[PDB]
Amino acid sequence: YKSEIAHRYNDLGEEHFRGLVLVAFSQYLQQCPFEDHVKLAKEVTEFAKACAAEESGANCDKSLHTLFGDKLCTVAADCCEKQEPDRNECFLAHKDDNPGFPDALCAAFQDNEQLFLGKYLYEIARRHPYFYAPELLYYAQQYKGVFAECCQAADKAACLGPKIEALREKVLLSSAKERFKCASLQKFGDRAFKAWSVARLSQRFPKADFAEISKVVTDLTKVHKECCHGDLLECADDRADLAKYMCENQDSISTKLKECCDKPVLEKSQCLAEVERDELPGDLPSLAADFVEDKEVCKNYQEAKDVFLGTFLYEYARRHPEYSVSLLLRLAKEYEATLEKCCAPPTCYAKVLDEFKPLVDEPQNLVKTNCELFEKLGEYGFQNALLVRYTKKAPQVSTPTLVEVSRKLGKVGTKCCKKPESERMSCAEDFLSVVLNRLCVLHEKTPVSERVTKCCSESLVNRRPCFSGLEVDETYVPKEFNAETFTFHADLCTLPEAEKQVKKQTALVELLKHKPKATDEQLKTVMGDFGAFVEKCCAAENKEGCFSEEGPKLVAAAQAALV
């Protein structure tokens, strides 16, 4: 109350506080030295620590942003002269996503652990300026755990290799997901998120009353709202409080929550987040009897629209674990929109009930078909298919972007396509919702396609629908073949396959940018000839060298195949 920095210092603790501040500066500035950030992060916590004792020390009276902003502005800047709650908005809009940035280690673990774990937070945070900081702290203590497990062992890279990567992937995905959440919260607004979380947790927690879930969602909303606005201390704190509340009344929400609440701190906050769904109790009326069969649905709808629709979202969501969170939201939107029409008459909205079936069917078909295809070519070929696809869809977009997001798109198949069929559609699009966001978040700063920004700006829920039905773009004026995109290097055959695939794919994107209306076979030819070219020349020893025949044999064969 009387001192907020002291409040958060008291509630969170010095270490988590310090870490969180370090993250804050890392995310906000991104561009500065590590030590320079540990300096500030060190000095702020001392002020906090002093004011945890003496709450009436000067400047401890202030709000967190008031201090934080001025203390930012001390760092050697048009953003700093707003000196209003707009400080942040400037500081927040100026956050660079896609910013660049590319026993010896363990020796430093024992020497200066806190520093070692600090730099992790720094590195991760500056890459991902919208990271769920608490989660990042969890990942930090995991990072602590790794070397403890492996650094005091005979073989290092064996037990260190896979676990670092395994952690890393889970860092990446986390970043992406939090970015989606905050994207909804900032670009689209409260209710979108406050609709999303309902369906999500309604799936997750059936038995739960709509009221209980409503509270949980309100709280979660608060947490992420402040968390992704730069209010990281409050986010962490309220997250902890939320987990407390969740674990307390578990018997009122879910049976499976017992496992998590025995953790120490951040751990239950993670378990809970990654706990699965309790058994649906049914029971369960028709769902027709009320929101369809009833003559009073509209009388009840008009009294409280958002409650009614929220209740419909709850009721429908819990009964269908197999539906994607996006789908259910589209169904809720359809229901609402029809209720806005049918209403101001139980004879019309007796037909809304199956207007869903198409909306349910299109995704299902999409997922099954793309999975069918996935089983055919595997991840790589799936990525290439999606690559060609999205190059056709949005050929004005940056190549490296079009590569990245297509790989991310294809990886979905590896995540959630070998699952039980019943589980395929739910996952596939939940992540698609995450991957797609990044296509646009990357597209916002540098926009070049009306259809992409439109698609991603119109509706939070109808993003995939717009992205899959997006036809081939004929407005696009294809550029002539530049010989330099097809200039190559000996290294090509020295490279690791993993980073070789990118080299193969970038060219394919660049290939379609020249002829977007190309055919399956037509591309297959050049994909064969490219192979032919690299294998003859790279095996050609004294090469290359041989690559000096780059054009006259390959491109001078490729452009013909593409007529």
Residue numbers in the entry: 3 to 78, 88 to 113, 121 to 362, 366 to 584
Question: Which sentences did the original study use to describe this structure?
Answer:
In the mammalian circulatory system, serum albumin is the most abundant protein (typical concentration of 2–5 g/dL).
The rCSA consists of three topologically identical domains (I, residues 1–196; II, residues 197–383; and III, residues 384–584), each of which is divided into two subdomains (A and B). Although our purification protocol did not include a fatty acid removal process, which is typically a powder-charcoal treatment conducted under acidic conditions, the overall structure of rCSA resembled those of the defatted HSA and other mammalian albumin3639.
